[PDB]
């Protein structure tokens, strides 16, 4: 290959200082955009939990931003994800993804705020094209650990999605990835 | 190969029902065995952190108890561990090996106990030949979620020393790892 770059809904690259929507192939009730939600069972003090809606026929999304090692957004690299919103004074914290500690009780590790940029952390995530129809996101947690004899010695998982609480909560998954789009704003 | 089976110290074959102490290889202050010690910043009511002493010439590690899948201690497959001591009622649930959160300040994470037996989660560990002399202690956390084309899909990681506190605590590392041997009782 060369690098890979990332496409809107439209076929323009994706632009490091713009904003999109995640949005789901799916129609119907099978869609559904990625937002910002308040976690049913979290003791932080801003909402923290990065779901998506039940169907499309409802809000849009909250809009995100990329943040790439440098400079520009391709396929399979490092980056950051980030709500990008006002926030009260209070909150200002808690836009940046992040991948949360094991769970018990769904056996796996859930999206949500409160991560931070450009650090060797539970903040990196990647795009890539899916198996079916569009991208999928990905998750490397712990790049900081070496994964024995992994590709590129890292940790990486497929995002998707578990159902806390009736409302659909991203999380890494095994199989059925969500297939996303990104749609600028 | 055939399954390798795991070897004392005096080449008999590990015992699922014999009690060892994990010793290390260096001699002097370069050595120290394993043991169950208090975590200088834990909440818990119990012991749970797994140490190792700063030299071999003071108290003898605290005796584990190793947990196949079954039925027998090999080389390269996933196993419980566990301190083999007596505890107080309420610390019962202390002494299984396990792997906690990601640890910002040390960007890995640490052993500590509380895990849980049979169960694809934080406990699980390997046990392998070294690559200098002996065998090393390996972590697969979150066996229950794929490692995407990694070596049978698992994320695997070196046991090792971070300094805490200015005592030894094993955890997760990417050199250096501790190269050990299982003395019986």
């Given at each position: 290959?060369?690098p ?16 999109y929507?995640?949005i ?8 559904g ?13 801003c ?5 998506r809606?039940?169907?499309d ?6 809009p ?22 006002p926030?009260?004074?209070?909150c200002?914290s ?9 769970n018990?009780?769904?056996?796996t ?8 940029i450009?650090?060797?952390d ?6 890539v ?11 490397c947690?712990?790049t ?6 992994c ?16 409302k659909?909560?991203?999380?890494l998954?095994?199989?059925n ?9």
């Amino acid at each position: 290959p060369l690098p890979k770059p990332v496409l809107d809904t439209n076929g323009k690259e994706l632009n490091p200082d713009s904003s999109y929507r995640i949005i789901s192939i799916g129609r119907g009730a099978l869609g559904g955009d990625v937002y910002l939600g308040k976690s049913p069972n979290s003791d932080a003090p801003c909402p923290d939990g990065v779901f998506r809606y039940n169907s499309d026929v409802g809000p849009s999304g909250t809009p995100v931003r990329f943040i790439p090692l440098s400079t520009n957004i391709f396929e399979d690299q490092l980056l950051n994800i980030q709500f990008n919103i006002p926030t009260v004074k209070l909150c200002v914290s808690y836009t940046i993804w992040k991948v949360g500690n094991l769970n018990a009780y769904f056996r796996t590790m859930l999206l949500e705020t409160g991560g931070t940029i450009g650090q060797a952390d539970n903040s990196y995530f990647k795009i890539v094209k899916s198996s079916k129809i569009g991208y999928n996101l990905l998750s490397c947690p712990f790049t900081s650990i070496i994964c024995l004899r992994c590709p590129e010695d890292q940790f990486c998982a497929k995002v998707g999605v578990v159902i806390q609480n009736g409302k659909r909560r991203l999380a890494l998954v095994n199989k059925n990835p969500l297939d996303v789009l990104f749609q600028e704003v």
